[PDB]
Design a protein around this ligand. Structure first.
Ligand SMILES: CCCCCCCCCCCCCCCCCC(=O)OC[C@H](COP(=O)([O-])OCC(O)COP(=O)([O-])OC[C@@H](COC(=O)CCCCCCCCCCCCCCCCC)OC(=O)CCCCCCCCCCCCCCCCC)OC(=O)CCCCCCCCCCCCCCCCC
Ligand SMILES: CCCCCCCCCCCCCCCCCC(=O)OC[C@H](COP(=O)([O-])OCC(O)COP(=O)([O-])OC[C@@H](COC(=O)CCCCCCCCCCCCCCCCC)OC(=O)CCCCCCCCCCCCCCCCC)OC(=O)CCCCCCCCCCCCCCCCC
Ligand SMILES: CCCCCCCCCCCCCCCCCC(=O)OC[C@H](COP(=O)([O-])OCC(O)COP(=O)([O-])OC[C@@H](COC(=O)CCCCCCCCCCCCCCCCC)OC(=O)CCCCCCCCCCCCCCCCC)OC(=O)CCCCCCCCCCCCCCCCC
Ligand SMILES: CCCCCCCCCCCCCCCC(=O)OC[C@H](COP(=O)([O-])OCC[N+](C)(C)C)OC(=O)CCCCCCCCCCCCCCC
Ligand SMILES: CCCCCCCCCCCCCCCC(=O)OC[C@H](COP(=O)(O)OCCN)OC(=O)CCCCCCCCCCCCCCC
Ligand SMILES: CCCCCCCCCCCCCCCC(=O)OC[C@H](COP(=O)(O)OCCN)OC(=O)CCCCCCCCCCCCCCC
Ligand SMILES: CCCCCCCCCCCCCCCC(=O)OC[C@H](COP(=O)(O)OCCN)OC(=O)CCCCCCCCCCCCCCC
Ligand SMILES: CCCCCCCCCCCCCCCC(=O)OC[C@H](COP(=O)(O)OCCN)OC(=O)CCCCCCCCCCCCCCC
Ligand code: HEM
Ligand code: HEM
Ligand code: FES
Lengths: 60, 114, 387, 77, 57, 122, 86, 57
């Protein structure tokens, strides 16, 4: 293992470099989307139309 | 800069060396190794150095056997583990205004096409 | 050292327009590039002027054009000059391509210039469509509806591209807005590509009708070729002014002076005349995807020419077979245009199919065979002369 | 009947211009890796397209949950 | 018109449908081609009934 | 790449040569480069390394004569005329003064085109 | 000054890249001494006659194109008639 | 520094890899969000549906 194996796998040839870049970008987009969704959902409690639905229309 | 770039490019190209080049170089090295000893002074100096550094004077049979083992894949492995994208030490003297800086020089030792 | 060779910008002007070695025996067929540049400049200026009175929408474009015609000061000159210059552009383009094809100018060392010219031709064709689709008359509406529907032939994302281009579900306000926005931008890209064309050409110089090296005899461009182009410029002006002042709607079909009614389908849906042969090639093949593939190939085949000429000579000046077959191909092109223009009747289908077959055979079978035959005949006769 | 008769171990292989089968066999991994990288880039640059989202991304398990719409009865008019 | 995109006339033609006078192709009250060089039947868009009205598309 | 004329294949059979001689004569008359006094070998392209090297291995008198021929042809083409019927290139002077040198250069280049592809069969 | 460019085939005045020349003599006359339009009609007429005679048949045989045009138009008109549908 | 070269090279390349990943994600997002404007606008999507009374004919 050590640190030479990491260089041998991804950081050895440019072709094996761009593919790693693209895959990491694809995963990072999903990760950041999940993070921002969670933080925005936690920020607003009792302030969105989905959480004020029963008060108004459920009573008709 | 062109000379340095081409030299380092040919250095880096050894990772994909063919089989005819290796055989030609092996023959040339086998010829030139024992062809530079003509005078008695040269032979004595060679004996002294060979015994001083290693500890024995290798017979020509041993040299031929060691050279024969070399194949193109060993050359590729050594060039990949020693030359491919590794640190270099340079030294310039004279009119070197046209010699570019260190990073640009080093960038040529590893080809980007592969 | 004189000023013109010292200052940067003046040196840039001098190296391309004043002091530039040229072959000393180039005929009158080498002036069409200057005519193309003049026509492009005229189009740019006239379009910039016309954009100050045009409103790009379904319910206001035709009325805006009419107001331009009969209410704006000297608007008829503007509209007629724009249309007639756009028509003359394709005539001069075809003459330029013919000159490049007849004398074998695609061979080395001028391949990059040929490729850049092909790209410019494609861009010009695309630009023409958006320009003519703006007035929103009957033929513009129906031809745009037919042509933009061809994007559905691609496998996958088929109708999605058509919907994205249309900006809705049918030809309406958004697609006219898109077309007006795009028609302004493309000519600038064309000008940049023309600059690239010239800078790629200048590195090796022009050819000559003889086809041999012209490095032995050269003359500067400044006094000689700046006055040989004036005659062509004045002749083009006298040609275009007659059209603009005595027959402004010359190349214009009768169905191009009516509002775009989306309920009455016209008898014939045809594009402008200069795009007719490609339309005929598209309509020849019964299949759909094959039709668009062949239509694209009919213009993309000009990139395969350099690797199809097995001739020791460079040109058709000393090629007896080439002179015959070139005019045969030109006649076939004219026949293709005529067939595409007219109705898709009984005999016309057969005639168009045969013409398309010949058009695609000329580029792929005839050229190598006759070049090889000419080389073989000349070599044999020369070899059998001493004994 | 041999190039360099004294050394019959050598031979000449078909070639166009430095294009030989021995060199051709060596560049195959580079072409495969470049093709994979190009495919991955094209994939990553088009993942919000509705057709791709509903055809390729959605059916895959553990990833389709994120790539699915979450609009209740409050939806398109 | 699936034939050449002309406008027929309803109830025109002895089959009680749509008759296309551009070339002379008649349809029936069920929109099925039976006379003329028209190649296919006529298409119907999707819908879903609601109340006493209808939504098309 | 390069012209692929197959006259050598035809010359194997004397029947074809005898049949095709008049056609070749008519074709060479029709091509009409002799009207300008040029030799056939002045029309080949010179823009690659091989031809540029071959032109440097010509005798001096041949190069000077070629320069004069090309200059005269260009001067004739400027004013749209041809040489009179007495100054046309005779068949005796229409020989191959460039083919052997180009062939030698191509053979030298082809010679090298083999050592690099050399492999060891073991 | 700037850089050493690639391999081209034009150079400039002086170094035009042509071959070495020897024994060439060239004469001319000032444009203000020669009479313009001298020997124009005769030379132009002779050149046009020669060009028509030699490259005429390469273009003339636009010959079958007009015939096929006329035949196609006539046959298409005939087939769209009363007796053509019999 | 006190280390072996491979560690330093790997550390140097990791930062560039993260750079490329984040930049590619951002570029894809902005490209899609700027080319989505050409799609069917929300105004046109409202008029796609049509309502007709079934009992009025
Ligand atoms: C995708 C990446 C493509 C970028 C090109 C590239 O990798 O460099 C050329 C390089 C060719 O050189 P090589 O033979 O592989 O040897 C590399 C040497 O270190 C030679 O390296 P060098 O020290 O000579 O540096 C060359 C490098 C200089 O360094 C840069 O990256 C320059 C950055 C400038 C703007 C960035 C773009 O230049 C380039 O990157 C090429 C031109 C950059 C854009 C050209 C703009 C107009 C043309 C369109 O790579 C290739 O073209 C092969 C394929 C690699 C990726 C595809
Ligand atoms: C007195 C009686 C009549 C005199 C009145 C004439 C006054 C005005 C006409 C101007 C004129 O003839 O002199 C200017 C002009 C001045 O001479 P120059 O430009 O210095 O000489 C050029 C070469 O030296 C000429 O070299 P060459 O003759 O050895 O070579 C043959 C020549 C042409 O000569 C011929 O073989 C035909 C001329 C034969 C005369 C009539 C014979 C009828 C029987 O080759 C070309 O120049 C062909 C041009 C190559 C392409 C251009 C056209 C292609 C169109 C493109 C088609 C579509 C594009 C497809 C690609 C797109 C696909 C995506 O004279 C000519 O060149 C005359 C030749 C024809 C060109 C003008 C045609 C206009 C109408 C005249 C019809 C002739 C009757
Ligand atoms: C589309 C088809 C065409 C596309 C492109 C084809 C070529 C481009 C046309 C450019 C025209 C260039 C040209 O010939 O004019 C310059 C030409 C000068 O050329 P250059 O420097 O002698 O060398 C070229 C030779 O023409 C070369 O001489 P050459 O030995 O080869 O013999 C050819 C000779 C042939 O000469 C003859 O056989 C006639 C002999 C008597 C001459 C009669 C006087 C003509 C005026 O050419 C001429 O003389 C023709 C000149 C007539 C000019 C025509 C202007 C308009 C025609 C342009 C295209 C037409 C297409 C539109 C069709 C309209 C309806 C659809 O002008 C003259 O002929 C001199 C006129 C002198 C004016 C005297 C009054 C001055 C008052 C003080
Ligand atoms: C309105 C649109 C046209 C507006 C006008 C458009 C035309 C503008 C002028 C033409 C283009 C500019 C000239 C370019 C050539 C040039 O540089 O000439 C300058 C000459 C000397 O140039 P030289 O021949 O190379 O000698 C100097 C060489 N040393 C000694 C330095 C080594 O020095 C001279 O003798 C003349 C110097 C004049 C510099 C230009 C002055 C600007 C023009 C003033 C207005 C003139 C009157 C106009 C009336 C219409
Ligand atoms: C216009 C830009 C807008 C988009 C911005 C985001 C771009 C994403 C770039 C990702 C980070 C770069 C990673 C490359 C690292 C690398 O590989 O460095 C290697 C190379 C050369 O070093 P070497 O080989 O000699 O090293 C030798 C090792 N022994 O350095 C570079 O080439 C730097 C390139 C950085 C990107 C260019 C930025 C400048 C453009 C803007 C300025 C001009 C504006 C013109 C008008 C638009
Ligand atoms: C359509 C509009 C075009 C312009 C309108 C006409 C312009 C005036 C023409 C009438 C007078 C001409 C000058 C007479 C000769 C003279 O007096 O000078 C002679 C000079 C040469 O200089 P010399 O030192 O060798 O002269 C000898 C000693 N003094 O030749 C000229 O300059 C030619 C002038 C023509 C102007 C250019 C025309 C060609 C345009 C090419 C377009 C290229 C692309 C452009 C893209 C925008
Ligand atoms: C081609 C036209 C380009 C014109 C140039 C415009 C100016 C460019 C400035 C770029 C700044 C970001 C714009 C905001 C886009 C957006 O919308 O960010 C919003 C997106 C949300 O995306 P989502 O709605 O799909 O989330 C779906 C939720 N379910 O957040 C992100 O993903 C974060 C990505 C990082 C932001 C960009 C990082 C920097 C990128 C530099 C490279 C730029 C390349 C430009 C190529 C031309
Ligand atoms: C065989 C080919 C298969 C390739 C498939 C992948 C192709 C995509 C490659 C990169 C394109 C990115 C475009 C970004 C999406 C966009 O610009 O706009 C996205 C639009 C609007 O989205 P929305 O508003 O509905 O949702 C918004 C969500 N918030 O979506 C569509 O209209 C689908 C159709 C768009 C297809 C893009 C086509 C681009 C040119 C492809 C050419 C293919 C030629 C093939 C020749 C054989
Ligand atoms: C190579 C460049 C150009 C070409 C080939 C071209 C072509 C055309 C054509 C064929 C038409 C149809 C006119 C008609 O049918 O009556 C047209 C219309 C139009 N063009 Fe251009 N054009 C070019 C440049 C420009 C430029 C640069 C602009 C704006 C700066 C422009 C703006 C317009 C406008 C506003 C119209 C509509 C006015 C009208 O149709 O009367 N054009 N163009
Ligand atoms: C706006 C469009 C164009 C401009 C401004 C332009 C400009 C020019 C000019 C001024 C010349 C010199 C004249 C000549 O050598 O014939 C030239 C040469 C040439 N052009 Fe164009 N051109 C255009 C379009 C095209 C097209 C569409 C093609 C090919 C499809 C093309 C291919 C060539 C070639 C091959 C030459 C070199 C001819 C030679 O050197 O003999 N050009 N161009
Ligand atoms: S087009 Fe209407 S039936 Fe023929």
């Amino acid at each position: 293992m050590a640190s030479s194996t990491i260089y041998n796998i991804f950081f050895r040839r440019n072709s094996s470099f761009y593919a790693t870049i693209f895959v990491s970008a694809f995963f990072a987009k999903i990760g950041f989307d999940v993070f921002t969704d969670s933080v925005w959902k936690r920020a607003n409690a009792g302030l969105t139309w989905d959480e004020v639905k029963p008060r108004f229309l459920n009573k008709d | 800069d062109d000379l340095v770039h081409f030299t380092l490019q040919n250095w880096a190209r050894l990772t994909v060396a063919t089989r005819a080049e290796v055989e030609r170089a092996k023959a040339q090295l086998r010829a030139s190794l024992l062809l530079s000893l003509d005078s008695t002074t040269a032979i004595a100096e060679d004996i002294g150095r060979q015994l001083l550094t290693t500890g024995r004077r290798m017979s020509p049979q041993e040299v031929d056997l060691r050279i024969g083992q070399i194949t193109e894949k060993d050359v590729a492995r050594v060039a990949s583990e020693m030359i491919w994208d590794k640190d270099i030490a340079v030294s310039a003297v004279g009119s070197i205004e046209g010699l570019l800086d260190y990073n640009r020089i080093r960038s040529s030792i590893s080809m980007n096409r592969w | 050292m004189k000023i013109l060779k010292s200052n940067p910008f003046l040196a840039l002007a001098n190296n391309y327009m004043i002091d530039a070695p040229e072959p000393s025996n180039i005929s009158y067929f080498w002036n069409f590039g200057s005519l193309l540049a003049c026509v492009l400049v005229i189009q740019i200026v006239i379009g910039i002027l016309l954009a100050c009175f045009y409103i790009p929408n379904m319910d206001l474009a035709f009325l805006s054009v009419e107001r331009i015609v009969r209410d704006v000061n000297y608007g008829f000159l503007l509209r007629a000059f724009h249309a007639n210059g756009a028509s003359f552009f394709f005539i001069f383009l075809y003459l330029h391509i013919g000159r490049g094809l007849y004398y074998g100018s695609y061979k080395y060392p001028r391949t990059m210039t040929w490729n850049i010219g092909v790209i410019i031709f494609l861009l010009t064709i695309i630009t023409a469509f958006l320009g003519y689709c703006l007035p929103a008359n009957q033929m513009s509406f129906w031809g745009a509806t037919v042509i933009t529907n061809l994007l559905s032939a691609v496998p996958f994302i088929g109708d999605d591209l058509v919907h994205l281009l249309w900006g809705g579900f049918s030809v309406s306000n958004p697609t006219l807005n898109r077309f007006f926005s795009l028609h302004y931008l493309m000519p600038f890209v064309i000008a940049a590509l023309s600059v690239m064309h010239l800078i790629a050409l200048h590195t090796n110089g022009s050819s000559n009708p003889l086809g041999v090296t012209a490095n032995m005899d050269r003359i500067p461009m400044n006094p000689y070729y700046l006055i040989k182009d004036l005659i062509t410029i004045f002749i083009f002006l006298i040609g275009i002014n007659y059209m603009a002042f005595y027959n402004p709607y010359g190349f214009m079909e009768p169905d191009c002076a009516l509002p775009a009614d989306p309920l009455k389908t016209p008898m014939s849906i045809v594009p402008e005349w200069y795009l007719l042969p490609f339309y005929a090639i598209l309509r020849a093949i019964p299949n759909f995807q094959l039709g668009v593939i062949a239509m694209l190939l009919s213009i993309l085949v000009l990139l395969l020419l350099p690797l199809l000429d097995f001739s020791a000579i460079r040109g058709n000046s000393f090629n007896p077979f080439g002179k015959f077959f070139f005019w045969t191909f030109v006649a076939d092109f004219v026949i293709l245009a005529w067939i595409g223009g007219s109705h898709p009747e009984n005999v016309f289908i057969t005639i168009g199919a045969i013409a398309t077959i010949f058009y695609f055979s000329y580029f792929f079978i005839l050229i190598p065979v006759y070049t090889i035959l000419g080389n073989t005949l000349i070599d044999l006769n020369l070899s059998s002369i001493k004994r | 009947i041999s190039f360099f008769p004294n050394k019959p171990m050598y031979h000449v292989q078909p070639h166009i211009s430095f294009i030989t089968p021995e060199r051709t066999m060596k560049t195959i991994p580079a072409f495969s890796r470049w093709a994979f990288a190009a495919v991955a880039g094209v994939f990553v640059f088009a993942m919000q397209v509705p057709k791709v989202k509903t055809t390729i991304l959605q059916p895959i398990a553990f990833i389709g949950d994120h790539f699915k719409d979450k609009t209740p009865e409050e939806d398109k008019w | 018109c699936t034939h050449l995109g002309c406008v027929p006339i309803g109830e025109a033609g002895d089959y009680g449908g749509w008759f296309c006078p551009c070339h002379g192709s008649h349809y029936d009250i069920s929109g099925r081609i039976r006379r003329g060089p028209a190649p296919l039947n006529l298409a119907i868009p999707a819908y879903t009934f609601e109340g006493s009205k209808i939504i098309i598309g | 790449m390069k012209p692929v004329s197959l006259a050598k294949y035809i010359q194997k059979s004397p029947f074809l040569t005898k049949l095709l001689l008049p056609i070749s004569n008519a074709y060479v008359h029709l091509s009409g480069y002799r009207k300008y006094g040029l030799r056939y070998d002045d029309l080949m392209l010179e823009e690659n390394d091989d031809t540029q090297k071959a032109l440097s291995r010509l005798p001096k008198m041949e190069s000077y004569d070629r320069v004069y021929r090309i200059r005269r042809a260009m001067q004739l083409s400027i004013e749209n005329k041809i040489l009179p019927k007495s100054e046309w290139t005779k068949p005796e002077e229409d020989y191959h003064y460039l083919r052997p040198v180009l062939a030698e250069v191509i053979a030298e280049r082809k010679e090298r085109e083999a050592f690099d592809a050399l492999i060891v069969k073991k | 000054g700037g850089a050493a460019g690639g391999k081209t085939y034009l150079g400039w005045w002086g170094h035009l890249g042509g071959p070495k020349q020897k024994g060439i003599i060239t004469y001319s006359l000032s444009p203000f001494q020669q009479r313009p339009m001298a020997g124009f009609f005769k030379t132009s007429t002779q050149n046009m006659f020669r060009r028509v005679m030699t490259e005429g048949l390469y273009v003339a045989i636009f010959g079958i194109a007009y015939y096929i045009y006329c035949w196609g138009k006539e046959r298409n008109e005939f087939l769209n008639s009363k007796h053509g549908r019999h | 520094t006190k280390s072996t070269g491979d560690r330093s090279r790997v550390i140097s390349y990791a930062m560039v890899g993260t750079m490329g990943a984040l930049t590619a994600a951002g570029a894809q997002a902005t490209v899609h969000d700027f080319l989505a404007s050409w799609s069917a606008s929300a105004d046109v999507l409202a008029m796609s549906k049509a309502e007709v009374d079934l009992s009025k004919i």
